[PDB]
From Swiss-Prot, chain A:
Residues of the full protein shown: 220 to 268 of 627
Regions crossing the membrane: 31-49
Localisation: Synaptic cell membrane; Cell membrane
Lineage top rank: taxon: Eukaryota
Name of this protein: Neuronal acetylcholine receptor subunit alpha-4
Swiss-Prot record, chain C:
Assembly and binders: Neuronal AChR is a heteropentamer composed of two different types of subunits: alpha and beta. CHRNB2/Beta-2 subunit can be combined to CHRNA2/alpha-2, CHRNA3/alpha-3 or CHRNA4/alpha-4, CHRNA5/alpha-5, CHRNA6/alpha-6 and CHRNB3/beta-3 to give rise to functional receptors. CHRNA2:CHRNB2 and CHRNA4:CHRNB2 nAChR complexes exist in two subtypes: LS (low agonist sensitivity) with a (CHRNA2/4)3:(CHRNB2)2 and HS (high agonist sensitivity) with a (CHRNA2/4)2:(CHRNB2)3 stoichiometry; the subtypes differ in their subunit binding interfaces which are involved in ligand binding.
Localization: Synaptic cell membrane; Cell membrane
Origin superkingdom: Eukaryota
Record field: transmembrane: 41-62, 68-84, 99-123, 167-186
Extracellular side: 85-98
Gene transcribed to yield this protein: CHRNB2
Protein family according to the UniProt entry: Belongs to the ligand-gated ion channel (TC 1.A.9) family. Acetylcholine receptor (TC 1.A.9.1) subfamily. Beta-2/CHRNB2 sub-subfamily.
Consequence when changing residue 89 to M: In ENFL3; approximately 10-fold increase in acetylcholine sensitivity
Disorder noted: Epilepsy, nocturnal frontal lobe, 3: An autosomal dominant focal epilepsy characterized by nocturnal seizures with hyperkinetic automatisms and poorly organized stereotyped movements.
Documented effect of changing residue 87 to E: Increases Ca(2+) permeability
The protein, known as: Neuronal acetylcholine receptor subunit beta-2
Organism: Homo sapiens
Residues forming coiled coils: none
Role noted for this protein: Component of neuronal acetylcholine receptors (nAChRs) that function as pentameric, ligand-gated cation channels with high calcium permeability among other activities. nAChRs are excitatory neurotrasnmitter receptors formed by a collection of nAChR subunits known to mediate synaptic transmission in the nervous system and the neuromuscular junction. Each nAchR subunit confers differential attributes to channel properties, including activation, deactivation and desensitization kinetics, pH sensitivity, cation permeability, and binding to allosteric modulators.
Stretches of the chain found on the membrane's Cytoplasmic side: 63-67
Length: 49, 84, 186, 163, 44
């Protein structure tokens, strides 16, 4: 229940909360693995003569 | 610019050449060692031929650069003339 | 005048189906011709301009070591143009556009070019202490030399001469096959 | 005929639920076969075309110094193809398209290739005066050489042969 | 990685310099030629 600025009475409401998850396999196979793989070269260049 | 890249790969293949393989200097020496005084450039066993073959490449590069910059400037003048 | 498109003729014909006896309709046919002056300058000229460089990687001297950069960049730009022409062409699996076919053909050709280029560049640097292999090479190349109209002529430069001979041969056959690649759609 | 998609069969079946005794519906099933040629020419030819360079990079000699350019160009182009083929597939984590799987595998392969190539390039340009380390390497690699079916044979030349 | 590129252009400059231009070895020799045991790197 709430009370708004317009009026004196109280107004009811129903709040529906959806808690959902994202299936991770797609973005972990096409987005994070390429960058995590190419981030392993920033230290490699120092060993190059 | 594609004409430039083809002419510069040509001058690379002419420059980086070796004396023992493609000597053939008879007709080239007389002509590409006398265009230099006309181009206003001051002059200087196998190493001597190598130096000569580098010098001819530098000379042809300069003699192409002159014409190329002339053509580019005349083109940029010719295209944008009517507005002004 | 619509601009890009030109109208040739607009006939209209009535169709009646005898067997059904209840199907009647009018079909107007539009024969429309594309004015190619816009698409030409914007797509075809850069296409031929960049594909003229396939025959070019061979004439570069191998000791400079710059074949790889030029050839890989040409292949990359060619793939970009292929994807672009595929995006602009309608996605119809019934027929293949001629330009896309030519680009795929010359792309496979550039792959053959890059593999033979890495081969000649590898055989270029072999020092005489590692891969001597003198008798099998001398007897074949001294006789192969005049058959190519190549100018007549320690071992470290002999390997360079080998590389130059073989890549000049590849260039001779490469320009020849590219001429037919162009003639196929002349 | 619609062009790309071709219909195989159009079955229709009436679904009755014995539990509800009221739910009734008619389900039509469309089994559609994509014509391959378009996506074939657009993806498969370039993918199989550029994948050879990953295993080709090793035949390149180390002295010229072009291993890095080749390998980085291949890996960059391969990541580009991966992102492009992922953009067109629907983002469903239920399964992986086999092309993407093979491409990720060859990407792991080429990123192992880059590190082994930098390692061989480092052991190549090594100078004979700094890192002698002869006896541990001499016997082992001179025994291994005949087992590799490679032609048999001033210390810098020996290091280059080792590389 | 940008810190890496700046440090690596620095080390390239330190490498390519010639003896007649940038000798300055007085402070360098005692400190940088006695750190290879501390780093477990064999000498020439
Ligand atoms: C998760 C990230 C940190 C991966 C980064 C890879 C490096 C930590 C590894 C991969 C191969 C390794 C090298 C493998 C070979 C050796 C030779 C050895 O001598 C010195 C370390 C070194 C260069 C290793 C250094 C570090 C390297 C580059
Ligand atoms: C045709 C118009 C648009 C410009 C012409 C400039 C080049 C196409 C021409 C000018 C001199 C030519 C060259 C003349 C000499 C030969 C030697 C030959 O060996 C190879 C081609 C080459 C370099 C030619 C290549 C092309 C070149 C640079
Ligand atoms: C717009 C594009 C196609 C220009 C590319 C130039 C080549 C197709 C032609 C121009 C002059 C030719 C050359 C002319 C001289 C000969 C000598 C011959 O021996 C071998 C081929 C070669 C180098 C030709 C190779 C190819 C070349 C460079
Ligand atoms: C499908 C593609 C990979 C075909 C590529 C052709 C090569 C298998 C052939 C063509 C000319 C050959 C070469 C011809 C000359 C010799 C010299 C010889 O010494 C070593 C092999 C080599 C380079 C050959 C290696 C392989 C080559 C490049
Ligand atoms: C056909 C597609 C995968 C293009 C890749 C070409 C390679 C399959 C061929 C081209 C030249 C070959 C090589 C030619 C020389 C030899 C030396 C030999 O020792 C071992 C095989 C090897 C490297 C060959 C390995 C494979 C190579 C790279
Ligand atoms: C997790 C991934 C990055 C493993 C990478 C493999 C390297 C850690 C190993 C594989 C073969 C090894 C080499 C095997 C031969 C020797 C010779 C030796 O002299 C110096 C180290 C070296 C190059 C080894 C260095 C490191 C290498 C490249
Ligand atoms: C936070 C840490 C990683 C310092 C970051 C490394 C560089 C920003 C600093 C460290 C020591 C500096 C150097 C200190 C000595 C000088 C000598 C001078 O001549 C030129 C700059 C230079 C190399 C400095 C360049 C930059 C350097 C490499």
């Amino acid at each position: 229940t709430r009370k708004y600025e317009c009026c004196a009475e109280i107004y009811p409401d129903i709040t529906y909360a959806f808690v959902i998850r994202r299936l991770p396999l797609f973005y972990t196979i096409n987005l994070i693995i390429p960058c995590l793989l190419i981030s392993c070269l920033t230290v490699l260049v120092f060993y190059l003569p | 610019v594609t004409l430039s890249i083809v002419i510069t790969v040509f001058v690379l293949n002419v420059h980086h050449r070796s004396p023992r393989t493609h000597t053939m200097p008879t007709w080239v020496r007389r002509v590409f060692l006398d265009i230099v005084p006309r181009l206003l450039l001051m002059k200087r066993f196998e190493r001597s031929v190598k130096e000569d073959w580098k010098y001819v490449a530098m000379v042809i590069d300069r003699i192409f650069l002159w014409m190329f910059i002339i053509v580019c400037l005349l083109g940029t003048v010719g295209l944008f003339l009517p507005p002004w | 005048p619509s601009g890009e498109w030109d109208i040739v003729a607009l006939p209209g014909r009535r169709n009646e189906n005898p067997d059904d006896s209840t199907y009647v309709d009018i079909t107007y046919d539009f024969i429309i011709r594309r004015k190619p002056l816009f698409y030409t300058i914007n797509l075809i000229i850069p296409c031929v301009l960049i594909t003229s460089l396939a025959i070019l990687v061979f004439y570069l001297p191998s000791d400079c070591g710059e074949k790889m950069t030029l050839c890989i960049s040409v292949l990359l730009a060619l793939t970009v143009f292929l994807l672009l022409i595929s995006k602009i062409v309608p996605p119809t699996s019934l027929d293949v556009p001629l330009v896309g076919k030519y680009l795929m053909f010359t792309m496979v050709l550039v792959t053959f070019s890059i593999v033979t280029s890495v081969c000649v560049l590898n055989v270029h640097h072999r020092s005489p202490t590692t891969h001597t292999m003198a008798p099998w090479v001398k007897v074949v190349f001294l006789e192969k030399l005049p058959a190519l109209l190549f100018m007549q002529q320690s071992v470290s430069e002999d390997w360079k001469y080998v590389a130059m001979v073989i890549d000049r041969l590849f260039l001779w056959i490469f320009v020849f096959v590219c001429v037919f690649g162009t003639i196929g759609m002349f």
